[PDB]
Design a protein around this ligand. Structure first.
Ligand code: CIR
Length: 271
């Protein structure tokens, strides 16, 4: 039953995020207080509103990017792959996630291979298979350690934004939310070519807005957190057509300046 979760692991953002977090382009100053309000609302949604049991990890001032828990672990059924992030300075974020995932009683596999890198952001799990983006953060070797870790599922690579999921994510069972850029469309074509199964697409005009969180929640049904009309009015109009989904608009305008999107800030676990 695709999209079932019971627990979410999140991590508070440090003050140092505003000045020190990595970012692909020069942009507006981060309002850290607003980032913090935004992250608290996102956590309220997962935990309070949807009834996930949320594990809130503490902020660490020396890891400015520690809010982006998605990059440090990939979880599938009862197994957590603790990644080796492509940004060397992010590698230490791994320790606290490992301990949290142990306490959730997952089987833990650690990427230790000094020649392997992988960000969880480069990883798209469709319910049937994995697509893994080969980017500046995720290499071949990292993708192979992922394949060797989740033996029950097919894994395929796609050349890559920062990550594969900078422009796609699952919006439902068999439904790939996808951006409209040359990049997003070239990647999707490769993904579609490499798999026998036929996925449906939800094409949005804003690549960044194709990053959403889908959940299947008992007594709720299909649930989708997506970017707001205020941030991306033309993409929100697309999500609005999902009449069988509970649609929840979530802002991430602040974290967006350091390249974070909706999926970057939780690890969703079914237990
Ligand atoms: O979107 C995901 N999964 N991660 C965003 C990480 C952004 C961060 N500033 C970095 O690693 O550069």
């Amino acid at each position: 039953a695709f999209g079932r979760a019971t627990h979410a692991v999140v991590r508070a953002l440090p003050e140092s995020l505003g000045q020190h977090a990595l970012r692909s382009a020069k942009g507006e100053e981060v309002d850290v207080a607003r980032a913090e309000r935004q992250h608290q609302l996102y956590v309220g949604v997962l935990g309070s509103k949807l009834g996930l049991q949320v594990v809130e990890l503490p902020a660490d001032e020396s890891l400015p990017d520690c809010v982006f828990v998605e990059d440090v672990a990939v979880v599938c059924e009862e197994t957590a792959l603790i990644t080796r992030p492509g940004a060397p300075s992010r590698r230490k974020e791994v320790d606290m996630m490992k301990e949290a995932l142990e306490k959730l009683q997952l089987n833990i596999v650690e990427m230790k291979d000094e020649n392997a890198t992988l960000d969880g952001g480069d990883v798209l799990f469709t319910g049937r298979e994995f697509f893994v983006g080969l980017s500046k953060r995720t290499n071949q070797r990292g993708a192979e350690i992922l394949a060797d870790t989740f033996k029950d599922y097919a894994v395929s690579t796609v050349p890559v934004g920062l990550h594969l999921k900078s422009f796609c994510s699952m919006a439902g069972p068999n439904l790939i939310a996808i951006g409209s850029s040359e990049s997003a469309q070239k990647a999707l074509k490769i993904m579609q070519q490499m798999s026998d199964h036929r996925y449906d697409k939800l094409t949005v005009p804003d690549d960044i807005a194709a990053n959403c969180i889908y959940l299947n929640i008992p007594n709720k049904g299909h649930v989708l957190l997506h970017r707001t009309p205020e941030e991306y009015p033309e993409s929100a109009k697309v999500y609005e057509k999902l009449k069988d989904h509970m649609l929840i608009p979530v802002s991430m305008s602040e974290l967006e300046k350091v390249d974070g999107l909706l999926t970057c800030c939780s690890v969703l676990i079914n237990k």
